[PDB]
Paper text:
Chelicerata sDscams could be classified into two subfamilies, sDscamα and sDscamβ, containing one and two variable Ig domains, respectively. Crystal structures and cell aggregation assays demonstrated that both α and β subfamilies of sDscam used Ig1 for the isoform-specific trans recognition in a hand-in-hand manner. Furthermore, the cis interactions were established by the three FNIII domains of sDscam, which assemble into a cross fold with a kink between FNIII2 and FNIII3.
The trans interactions of Chelicerata sDscam were mediated exclusively through the Ig1 domain for both sDscamα and sDscamβ subfamilies. It is worth noting that sDscamβ subfamily has two variable Ig domains, Ig1 and Ig2. Similarly, sDscam Ig1 also employs the ABED face to form an antiparallel homodimer. However, among the seven Ig1 structures reported here, the complementary electrostatic potential surface pattern (negative in one end, neutral in the middle, and positive in the other end) has been only observed in the three β isoforms, but not in any one of the four α isoforms.
Residue numbers in the entry:
A (entry chain A), B (entry chain A): 1 to 145, 148 to 194
The structure:
């Protein structure tokens, strides 16, 4: 003779552009209930790419297409004539890397410090690592370790460049979601 | 440009008499789909305490009230004009112990072998253990370990009974679900 909201869960790997549903019902049939949905304690109302379907014994929350904004806790509250119960589940929208500043081919003078921007956006925030050809056919790629500093935002700083610093450089962006972003650029060094 | 059934799960602790739902939808909106539900590869059809609700972008399976028979794998199949996809989740209905043969007060002759039946039903199948008062006020209870054999089905066999075997005996039935079943009986031994 009690009232319990049946637990609901969102699927693990939800990504932007996909569809997300959530179903709220009671554990034992009561047939005298009403529903209300909330995001972070604030009530959700049926419009705006978020649609709430009300039925006799269940309610459906629908988010389509989902954006990164839709992350948060979603709560259903059931009211049956004397008592109200709730259940809350957390939705985390993920996204594969997207380009923000692509790297570029550069031609700079010997002895100069240069920066190569490779910044992306995604959830979780992607990791950027840089590799160099060290062979101009450009099939082999190796990691970088003296005058090469990768700044935390994915920018490669090459200090006091010389002819050996020429070659093909590739930055890789990955957060374990979707496909990785990759882009190769050539660095030329010249005497002024 | 593919078709994936969004995963669905049943709640952990489903018990007989409760209600069970399942929602089938696509990962990405397609709007050109149809639904069919199956239990153990055999199609479910809307009647008989199992009702299937069909809508434009989702379908709902409803089992209310659920019985132990309803355990099994439940599969939703979505068809969109060229391709069909599926998802399967396993439902296991549980139940607290219910009495099948309660123990009884017995009065038997010295030197006889007697059996005390304490058999229950439940899912998972419950464990039965026996305890003796060893004090007729009947507040303290202890386990049993020479002429006391508990047979695997919860029956307590007391061999060659004597006056010391008199007292209050209690069998306990538990499977970790709901409430345990308990029942105390008195054993009298007499000379013929
Ligand atoms: C989504 O929900 C999680 C946990 O789910 C529970 O939410 C809490 C508040 C209870 O209502 C439970 O019944 C729900 O199941 C939240 O994470 C919790 O946030 C609480 C903040 O109110 C934390 O409690 C605080 O803890 C400190 C330190 O002990 C204490 O001094 C405070 O008084 C206060 O009680 C709690 O520890 C959090 N637990 C976990 C597992 O995270 C989410 O809110 C929070 O999310 C975390 C990751 C941070 O970003 C917080 O800044 C944020 O408030 C909640 N999210 C939203 C959007 O509501
Ligand atoms: C090329 O890069 C080097 C070092 O790396 C720098 O990277 C640039 C892009 C900036 O992000 C800097 O903030 C990094 O440090 C520069 O040489 C460094 O210059 C710093 C000061 O301008 C030095 O810091 C000093 O170090 C002393 C001794 O260790 C310390 O006590 C002080 O706190 C002081 O801050 C730093 O040590 C230098 N690098 C190394 C490896 O020692 C280049 O610029 C500068 O070169 C220095 C030595 C001076 O002559 C400056 O006038 C000159 O601008 C930078 N640009 C070039 C080479 O054109
Ligand atoms: C409910 O589903 C589980 C597992 O879920 C999967 O079902 C299998 C068959 C695949 O379709 C997957 O894609 C689903 O996710 C079943 O458990 C499996 O049963 C299979 C029987 O066909 C087992 O495969 C067999 O394995 C032997 C030994 O390696 C092999 O030689 C055979 O050729 C055959 O491939 C498989 O190993 C099982 N896996 C697990 C994790 O249990 C359920 O069916 C089975 O349930 C088990 C507990 C036993 O009772 C079996 O007798 C029973 O068939 C399935 N239940 C129902 C009612 O369909
Ligand atoms: C009271 O219980 C004892 C032993 O426990 C029995 O429990 C009853 C309820 C039944 O489930 C039996 O199957 C259990 O064994 C009985 O005495 C046992 O009798 C068995 C044969 O009837 C003996 O098995 C034998 O043992 C020898 C030597 O070890 C072995 O080589 C053989 O294979 C042979 O099968 C068993 O050993 C006895 N118990 C003990 C502890 O040794 C009581 O009944 C019987 O008492 C025996 C000794 C004979 O006199 C039978 O004619 C008599 O019916 C049983 N009922 C009473 C005491 O009234």
């Amino acid at each position: 003779g009690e009232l319990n909201v049946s637990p609901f869960v969102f699927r693990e790997n939800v990504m932007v552009g996909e569809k997300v549903t959530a179903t709220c019902t009671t554990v034992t049939e009561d047939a005298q209930i009403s529903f209300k949905w909330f995001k972070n304690g604030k009530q959700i109302n049926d419009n705006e790419h978020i649609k709430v379907l009300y039925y006799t014994d269940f309610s459906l929350l629908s988010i389509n297409p989902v954006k990164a904004d839709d992350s948060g806790n979603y709560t259903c509250v059931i009211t049956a004539k004397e008592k109200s119960s709730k259940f809350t589940a957390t939705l985390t929208v993920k996204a594969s890397p997207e380009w923000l500043i692509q790297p570029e081919n550069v031609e700079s003078v010997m002895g100069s410090n240069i920066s190569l921007q490779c910044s992306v956006t995604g959830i979780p925030t992607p990791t950027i690592n840089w590799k160099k050809s060290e062979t101009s056919s450009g099939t082999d790629f190796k990691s970088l370790s003296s005058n090469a500093i990768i700044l935390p935002g994915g920018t490669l700083n090459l200090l006091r460049i010389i002819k050996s610093d020429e070659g093909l450089y590739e930055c890789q962006a990955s957060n374990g979601i979707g496909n990785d972003l990759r882009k190769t650029v050539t660095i030329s060094v010249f005497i002024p």
